[PDB]
């Protein structure tokens, strides 16, 4: 696998360079290509033959090569540029393509944003099956990093909690979810349950009461 940095950054409007290090048998052979992978979308060819741009690729994307190291430079960074980037190169044969380890690009300079929090009680249909899943949906926060704490009657819960890691929404901010998996009887045995979300040292809490749903 060709060597790329696992992650790099660069603020809006600026430029950033992603390197791709190999040997004289792949990169040095002198036909490197680059690809763009935005989540929830098909991969996009950017560069081929070290420097040539694929159709519909703006000039602010540009590739170069220096011996056994290729470089993809992206000028005038936009939030749309946040994606995984991969280099590639044939080796000892045109049917033997070798991709790079991949680089996760981050575009900084984004305004900090607190999370919106919606806590859902279990449905009646789920309760009829003797299960009770509380769903805490967290959205529109930046940077994408929250910690979630669950409570029952103000007392912390450690058991039966599962939280997804943050991913981007098409509005460019972050969203995450957390689930508390109870039985129906557990759900009824408490006065209240709470979803407590901390972001940047500040916490938002939502509470539901079984007595009222």
């Amino acid at each position: 696998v060709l060597n790329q940095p696992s992650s790099v950054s660069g603020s809006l409007g600026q430029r950033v360079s992603i390197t791709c290090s190999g040997s004289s048998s792949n990169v040095g052979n002198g036909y490197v290509s680059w690809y763009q992978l935005i989540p929830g979308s098909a991969p996009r060819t950017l560069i081929y033959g070290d420097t040539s741009r694929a159709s519909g690729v703006p000039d602010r994307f540009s590739g170069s090569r220096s011996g056994n190291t290729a470089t993809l430079t992206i000028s005038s960074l936009q939030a749309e540029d946040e994606a995984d980037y991969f280099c590639a190169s044939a080796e000892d044969s045109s049917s033997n393509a070798v991709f790079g380890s991949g680089t996760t690009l981050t575009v900084l300079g984004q305004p900090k944003s607190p999370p919106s929090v919606t806590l859902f009680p279990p449905s009646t249909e789920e309760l009829n099956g003797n299960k009770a899943t509380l769903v805490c949906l967290i959205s529109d926060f930046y940077p994408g990093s929250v910690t979630v704490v669950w409570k029952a009657d103000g007392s912390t819960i450690t058991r039966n909690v599962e939280t997804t890691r943050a991913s981007k929404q098409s509005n460019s901010k972050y969203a995450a979810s957390s689930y508390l998996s109870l039985t129906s009887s557990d759900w009824k045995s408490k006065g209240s349950y709470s979803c407590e979300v901390t972001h940047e040292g500040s916490t938002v809490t939502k509470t539901v009461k079984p007595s009222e749903c």
Binding site: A42, A88, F99, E126, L137, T164
Partner: protein
């Protein structure tokens, strides 16, 4: 506007044979080398192989004993077959068109000139201007760099990509999701806007797709990534936020789980109380 559609099983058992099909549109399959690229979750892209318009396949050397790629120009189909799959073969499988070429070309240094024959088999480069000659020279002071046969350039790149098919290798069984409506307790909200959703519970394998009101409701929708529960099954939620008040507005989440050939359209009503 080339379209590449992968098709095949979303779930395969360990040691079974995975077989995928790529159906093409926007071009004839007899003018393009079609291939396969896969990406295991959170891992790098990996080349599998391709088959050119002539019908000869080319494979990843580290994998080719398990790979088979066949073509059908009349029906415009390319196959991928992976034998004896293991957990590590779980990945998104991309169908692709590919450019492949092996060119012994020429980048004569700026202080050299095009030469042909004499001191070299075929074309080459000669020192300076080679004394105004044409045949290569390797006698002092002249130096010759011959094309020989080891100065080949192997050229590869992917131009068109498919959307990819997620394949899971697992001994677990395909399981259709339970879909539950999500609505806030009566008097437990920060209106005017009303948020509601669906809980897509306990399915196997990924993916599930969620839409609202048959696509007639795009804005305000966010489908969250799935979580893997200790039970070994997945769950996810989709949420939609609307101006509120109501009616008329009815809200239906359309859940599709292709792996189990199941669709669920769940009515979500804003409680009542």
């Amino acid at each position: 506007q080339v379209q590449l559609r992968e098709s095949g099983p979303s779930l395969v058992k360990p040691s079974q044979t995975l077989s995928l099909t790529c159906t093409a549109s926007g071009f004839s399959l007899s003018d393009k080398a079609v291939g396969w690229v896969r990406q295991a979750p959170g891992k790098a892209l990996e080349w599998l192989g391709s088959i050119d318009t002539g019908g000869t396949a080319g494979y990843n050397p580290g994998l080719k004993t398990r790979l088979s790629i066949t073509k059908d120009n009349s029906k415009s189909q390319v196959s991928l077959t992976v034998s004896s799959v293991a957990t590590e073969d779980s990945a998104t499988y991309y169908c692709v068109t590919v450019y492949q070429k092996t060119t012994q070309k020429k980048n004569c240094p700026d202080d050299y000139t095009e030469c042909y024959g004499g001191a070299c088999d075929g074309t080459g480069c000669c020192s300076g201007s080679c004394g105004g000659a044409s045949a290569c020279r390797d006698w002092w002071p002249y130096r010759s760099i011959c094309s020989s046969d080891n100065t080949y350039t192997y050229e590869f790149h992917v131009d068109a990509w498919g959307q990819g098919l997620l394949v899971t290798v697992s001994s677990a069984s395909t399981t259709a999701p339970k879909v539950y409506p999500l609505s806030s307790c009566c008097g437990d909200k920060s209106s005017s806007t009303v948020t509601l959703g669906c809980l897509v519970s306990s399915y196997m394998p990924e993916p599930v797709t969620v839409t609202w009101n048959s696509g007639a409701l795009k804005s305000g929708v966010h489908t969250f990534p799935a979580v893997l529960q200790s039970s070994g099954l997945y769950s996810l939620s989709s949420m939609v936020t609307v101006p509120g008040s109501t009616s008329g507005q009815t809200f239906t989440c359309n859940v599709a789980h292709p792996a189990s050939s199941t669709k669920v359209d769940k009515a979500v009503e804003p409680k009542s109380c």
